[PDB]
Homo-oligomer: A and B are copies of this chain.
């Protein structure tokens, strides 16, 4: 019955595609994490310019709201999607709820790392909500990975 299944594979991939776009947006916050207190050098490495991180986290925030806006535009995965959409709302929330240390002239490095740097030894100002958001997008990626693998398996199962 290749008629039905043709659609089913498109639909499932469409979701997996949408999910990876959000998993990649989030990974860009991990690259932003490598940029706290850094400028560009001629050789292409990163050199230190300490404790000016206001617009770095501003863009980190900007991305974290794109993530929510992307999740919203998403069968069967309702629970794992809404659980992820709630996670990204509490990442934006915790960032915006910390302006007094993330929203000033000369945002320091220390409180910058506390917001977008995973495994930061000192999670206080948003990282925990980001780590929890990374795990939440894994369970959803795997769910939509398996969801599409199931529609391909329908091809061959007698």
Spell out A's residues near B (CB within 8 Å). Answer: 2-3, 5-6, 9-10, 13, 16-17, 20-25, 27-28, 31-32, 34-44, 46-47, 49, 52-63, 65-66, 92, 95-97, 99, 102-107, 148, 152, 155-156
Contact = CB atoms under 8 A, between A and B. Distances in A.
A28 to B, nearest CB: 4
29 contacts: A3-B155, A5-B155, A6-B156, A9-B9, A16-B17, A17-B17, A20-B21, A20-B24, A24-B25, A25-B25, A25-B27, A28-B63, A32-B32, A32-B62, A38-B59, A39-B57, A40-B57, A40-B58, A40-B95, A40-B99, A40-B103, A42-B99, A43-B96, A52-B52, A53-B55, A56-B58, A56-B59, A59-B59, A59-B60
**Stoichiometry (number of copies):** 2
Nearest to A35: B59
Nearest to A105: B49
Contact of A55 (B5, B25, B36): B36
B59 A34 contact: yes
Contacts of A53: 55
A53 to B, nearest CB: 5
Which residue, A41, A58, A96, A152, has most C-beta atoms of chain B within 10 A?
A: A58
Contacts of A36: 55
B105 A52 contact: yes
Given A20-B24, A55-B56, A156-B2, A61 B40 contact: yes
